[PDB]
Design a protein around this nucleic acid. Structure first.
Lengths: 95, 110, 92, 103, 76, 97, 83, 105, 93, 76
DNA sequence: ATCGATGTATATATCTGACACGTGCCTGGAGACTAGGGAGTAATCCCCTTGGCGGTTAAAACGCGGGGGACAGCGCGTACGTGCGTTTAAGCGGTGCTAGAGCTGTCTACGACCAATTGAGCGGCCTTCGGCACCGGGATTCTGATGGGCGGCCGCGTAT
DNA sequence: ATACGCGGCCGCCCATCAGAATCCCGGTGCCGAGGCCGCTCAATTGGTCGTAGACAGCTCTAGCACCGCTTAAACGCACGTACGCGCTGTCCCCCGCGTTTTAACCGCCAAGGGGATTACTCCCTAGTCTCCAGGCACGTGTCAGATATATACATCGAT
């Protein structure tokens, strides 16, 4: 049949996590995937840009790390890094 | 000794009448979320110009729906500043120019 | 000064005469100004026209770079994106 | 397996693929798919709930488009991040300008 | 009026707060007597975990209410 | 004895100053200021003298543009002198902030 | 020594000249102070963007090159000095 | 002819631009007359801009061309500065233009 | 080690059109910058479109529309023309 | 003053021009007579291609000179 | 009603240091060969957009008049530009140093490539309990015709 | 001829039975998480060779910092004229509202254009080889423009 994949499974549990027996319209659901896919290119594209400025050829986590910092304002940014840094840190701990 | 009371508002309540609706309609319009402009004249307006730039045109149901959304939203936004400008001026009247400055400084207008 | 098999057909859906003036004021108050000038609202449609063309200009172009007869709504989105008025809700 | 080992709610083995197929740099750093899933989940969660608050503010069981922007437009931060990204069936905050008072 | 919280210890604590005042604001006053962070404290009423920026009227709080308390986990 | 009628000098320069390209901001103070904040993220870092200019140009022009928007709005009101709000008004409408 | 008494460096006249460049005719006393605040806002954000890459690059002596890309980010591209 | 540029009759570098289209990651396969087409295009644009730049230099009594000469050249033409509207200029300088009403009676 | 410039390509065409005329060293640099930016917006444009309908190729037409959109009218159309002629010029040869 | 242009067929047309008139103005006049756009015209006299932005006087073109109109030599 | 003082353009030659040149070497450009999958084209089907049609039924669409906001007049206030004098600090190109950029050379970690196996994900389909607002049965309270006995009708009526 | 009797009517309080009305117990309609499912097509598993890239090494650029004579720019300070701006007042351009007429909207019924998939081969490119001249560094000087200094007129405002 057709494809047209989306992030619907990811957005839904997140909302469950923050009000479990709280609801949503089928119109705000796409707004959400539209919103995510939009932020996706915003961050990953910028990573691509720096990589081939100061003369290197792969994109790691550090770059995102840097990228994120100047893409967003002071207070959210730090918490965001923190969360980000740990999630991965744990990831490696396992293996 | 029976004295039917004027307790209910009817059309004499709600303060007086001066600038009475002025702010009223505003509020009701805000709570709502329906299209400000009709969805039938708009539909042809596009079909009609779209022909001038190319021939044998077709249109997705939404595509217009979407334009309506864009446009409406586009104007309101315009007016929203216009208003400010208007206020700046000691006025509560949007004016033919009030439109221009707004655009000029945003930059589409020269 | 004759009936002369007279038939009357004039055009008021698409054309700007046809469209509804309250349809605008409806729009004007959401912003919440107290007063509408006659002069003003005529200009406003004027601009609408200017905004509307450029988009379709592009729309048309994307419909046509792909050799398609049916114009996609996505096609409109990118258009909006190019001017920096991108619309969430649509066509990821 | 990805969510597990990583410990996130987001798909770690999905954004890795697109980042390599988007064609960003030559190869891809091992850092990113994982890290990139993480912040995304974090943002995902930051809106849902304020949207929740907004629906409860005016007392509603289900959240809908109208709510989402009400949530964001009012918020100082999110609002700037999505400053010029404009929004489905959204309408607007109540606003009454000063000298437009009914004295 | 009067607001009641049931702790994990079980011991019942009685403190008096205006209903107009927001729940978050009231928590701060209860976190100065016990010397414990409001963050750390988790409260549930009638199967709902307490929500920040929710007024007591919107929570239909009653005098002598019974609210379950949960201690918090962050692993790291 | 003679003193120019008000508004006779200011325009004359406007243009003189409009024709030319050369920067208006000072080389030393600018530099110090740039150093002041940069330290406040991380302390004691260096920049090629040009790198400083690169930075100097992008902002010098930037103001002059805003002042231009401020002026129209001063005009729109039947006024004559750029007032404060106009700048802010301008800032708010551009919706940069 | 942490640089301070900096904000003033941009004295009365220099702010004014910009404005003439702008095509303003005259100017109230009050806004010399207002603009300095913004100027600062603008520098902060750009330098904020710039500095990170420089740190990213394992170096201190932040380049003109960063000044610019950092400008390209905020959305003020410059023709003149770069690459 | 050996040099490609010459087979397409041009000054712009056929093959140098081809490689730049492969070192820029822009895509998996590079087209064959794309490169040329593109080279030639810019060629025009340069010219287009560089055609009046010189005329501006003629205007002001010089045989050379300093950057302002590029700046005025771009601002006046509507179809020139329109595209570059997002371009700001190494010491660009300013068009003399004084608003209507502050000029004196 | 090998600082690149597009100064060489400007250098000929300058003379071709205004031979009693010259370039500032920074004015040339400005032009070098300009082309590359100009090379990238287009290339960027090109790439997006390729991807949109999954096109593992930037052909000679993908660029053409790209320009058409990117450019304001009077300039755009001439450039479209030069473009095809060149293909015309080159393939038989 | 008049100049002449020998068209592709060999047919000569007369244009009324000044020696300060630009090559594009003359190409616009040929567009006005022949319907050939300025961009497809090359104006030749005796081993110089006349260039856009330059004048008739830049090439010392004076009274009752004949210019040769050619289209665009395509490698085929 | 003529005049002066200032600011701006313009004249002069002239010296200098950056734009142009020529040379010469090497890495980036041209040509030659192949293989394989990208991308067109050529074939079928059924979904989507356009159209026409009636019919109400609320809105569009008007006007008129007068209220209320816009704009023209007036008048006081004071604050900023234009210029002067004193003082304060950048800018000017000079030296001198070493720190940090840039080069350079081997190792190696980590990603791309090829292989195979299974379950996370989407549409499509299907589920029951809980809350908004309409609603159901029984005892109980207030209205309506009934009814003899105590009083009053003054006006027809029989008895001596 | 002359006086007594009364007869149904009538206001009275005082008795009987069903109808209306609130609380005691309520069902219904609409949305939104669970759960089932099942072929399957996209990620994961176990794994070598090599190449970017970090790193260890180095020196020789360029980023600071200082020093002192000169001087262009910044300051502080004092005056007044011509601007902001609040007051004031009318005339007329919009609002609000009463009615008349238009066109929006929904529902129905039609037909094929065009969009998406599938199946196949051959044209077009990267990727790989060999060789060489265009293009740069290397070297060097002049000529285009920049400064200082003489020379006359404009021009806005004071009288």
């Amino acid at each position: 049949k057709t494809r047209k994949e989306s992030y619907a499974i990811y957005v839904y549990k997140v909302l469950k996590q923050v009000h479990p027996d709280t609801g949503i319209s089928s119109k705000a659901m796409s707004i959400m995937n539209s919103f995510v896919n939009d932020v996706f290119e915003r961050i990953a594209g910028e990573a691509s840009r720096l990589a081939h400025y100061n003369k290197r050829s792969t994109i790691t986590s550090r770059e995102i790390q840097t990228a994120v910092r100047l893409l967003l304002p002071g207070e959210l940014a730090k918490h965001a890094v923190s969360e980000g840094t740990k999630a991965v840190t744990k990831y490696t701990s396992a293996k | 000794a029976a004295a039917a009371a004027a307790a209910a508002a009817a059309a004499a309540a709600h303060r007086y009448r001066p600038g009475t609706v002025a702010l009223r309609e505003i509020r009701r319009y805000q709570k709502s979320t329906e299209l400000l402009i009709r969805k039938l004249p708009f539909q042809r307006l596009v079909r009609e110009i779209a022909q001038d730039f190319k021939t044998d045109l077709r249109f997705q149901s939404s595509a217009v729906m979407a334009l309506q959304e864009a446009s409406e939203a586009y104007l309101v936004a315009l007016f929203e500043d216009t208003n400010l400008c208007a206020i700046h001026a000691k006025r509560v009247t949007i004016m033919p120019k009030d439109i221009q400055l707004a655009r000029r400084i945003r930059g589409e207008r020269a | 000064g004759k009936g002369g098999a007279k038939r009357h057909r004039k055009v008021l859906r698409d054309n700007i005469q046809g469209i509804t003036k309250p349809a605008i004021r409806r729009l004007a108050r959401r912003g919440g100004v107290k007063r509408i000038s006659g002069l003003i609202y005529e200009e406003t449609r004027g601009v609408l026209k200017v905004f509307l063309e450029n988009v379709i200009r592009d729309a048309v172009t994307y419909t046509e770079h792909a050799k398609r007869k049916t114009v996609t709504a996505m096609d409109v989105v990118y258009a909006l994106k190019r001017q920096g008025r991108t619309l969430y809700g649509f066509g990821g | 397996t990805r969510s597990s080992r990583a410990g996130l709610q987001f798909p770690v083995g999905r954004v890795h693929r697109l980042l390599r197929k988007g064609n960003y740099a030559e190869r891809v750093g091992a850092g990113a798919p994982v890290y990139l899933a993480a912040v995304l989940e974090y943002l995902t969660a930051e809106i849902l709930e304020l949207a929740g608050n907004a629906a409860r503010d005016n007392k509603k069981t289900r959240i809908i488009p109208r709510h989402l922007q009400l949530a964001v437009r009012n918020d100082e931060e999110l609002n700037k991040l999505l400053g010029r990204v404009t929004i489905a069936q959204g309408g607007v905050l109540p606003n009454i300008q000063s000298v437009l008072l009914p004295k | 009026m009067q607001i009641f919280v049931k702790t994990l210890t079980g011991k019942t604590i009685t403190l008096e707060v205006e209903p107009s005042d927001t729940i978050e604001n009231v928590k701060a006053k209860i976190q100065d007597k016990e010397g414990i962070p409001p963050d750390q404290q988790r409260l549930i009423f009638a199967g709902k975990q307490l929500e920040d920026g929710r007024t007591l009227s919107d929570y239909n709080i009653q005098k002598e209410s019974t609210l379950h308390l949960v201690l918090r986990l962050r692993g790291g």
